[PDB]
C-alpha cells in the first residue's frame, strides 16, 4: 500500500540520463526507452519515471493478449458484434476486431474480452509479468483510474520482457498483438505502440503512449508518461515521436 506507488528496484543495467524538459515544455513527465541491441535504458526524469499510475488504456495490450493465450479471441475471428448502445463515438458504435479496438481503444471490447477471464489467471499473469503493483481491487476495469497502477520505467520493462523472453504466450498471440499496434511503416522503420488516457472530472488526469520501434539495426521499447500540463494520451504520443525523431530512432 505504502510504496506500491513507487517502483523502487533498481537497474542491473547502464541508465543514461536524457534531459527533453524543451520537448516536454509546459508538461509535466517522463520518457524511457531500451536498446535490445546496447541493452541499455535512457531515461528522462528517472523520479517520476518509477511513480506508478493508472496504465488506462495502455492495460488493453495486455487484455489482449490474455484474450490470445485464453482463446476468447484468435487469428481467424477477433470480431465482436456492437450490442447497439450509443457510445458517444461514433467509431466505438459498430461491430470490432482486434485491430479496429485497439486502434479506436474501444472499451466495450477489451470490457467484454476482461468479463471472461477468471481473477485467479489475472493475478498469476501479473505477478509473473511482474506488472506494477499488481492491485486488482474490485477487479471491475480496474485498469480506469482504479487500483492498477504501474510506472513509467516498468511499462518499458513488463512490455520488453513479455514480448522477448520465450514464456507460455506463444509467437502468433505475440505477432497478431503487434500487428494491432503497428502504427507507422516506412522503409526505415515501423513504429507500434498504445496510447492511453486517464479523465477525472472532464480534465486529462494521465497521458501514456507505451510501444517499440523496429528498424534494420535494432529494436526500441519505450513510454511515454504525462502526469501534468496537457496529459493525454494523444500529447504523449507527439512527445514520444519527437523524442525518437530526435535521437534518430525515427528516420524518413
Ligand atoms: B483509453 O485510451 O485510455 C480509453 S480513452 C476513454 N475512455 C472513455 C470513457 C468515457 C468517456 C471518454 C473516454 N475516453 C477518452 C476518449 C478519447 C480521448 F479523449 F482520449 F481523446 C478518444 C476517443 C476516440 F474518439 F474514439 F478516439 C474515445 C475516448
Known sequence: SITDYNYKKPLHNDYQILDKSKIFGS????????????????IYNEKESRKRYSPNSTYKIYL????????????????????????????????????????NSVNWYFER????????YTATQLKQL??????????????????LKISNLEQVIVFKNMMEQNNHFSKKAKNQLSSSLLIKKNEKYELYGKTGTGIVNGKYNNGWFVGYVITNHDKYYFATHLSDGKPSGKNAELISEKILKEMGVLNG
Open 64 to 103: 489482449a493478449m490474455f484474450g490470445l493465450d485464453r482463446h476468447i479471441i484468435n487469428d481467424e475471428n477477433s470480431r465482436m458484434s456492437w450490442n447497439h448502445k450509443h457510445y458517444p463515438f461514433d467509431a466505438w458504435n459498430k461491430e470490432q476486431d482486434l485491430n479496429t479496438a485497439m486502434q
Open 113 to 120: 474480452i476482461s468479463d471472461q477471464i477468471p481473477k485467479n
Open 130 to 147: 511482474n506488472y506494477g503493483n499488481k492491485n486488482l481491487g474490485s477487479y471491475k476495469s480496474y485498469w480506469m483510474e482504479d487500483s
Open 27 to 42: 508538461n509535466s513527465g517522463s520518457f524511457v526507452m531500451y536498446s535490445m541491441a546496447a541493452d541499455a535504458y535512457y
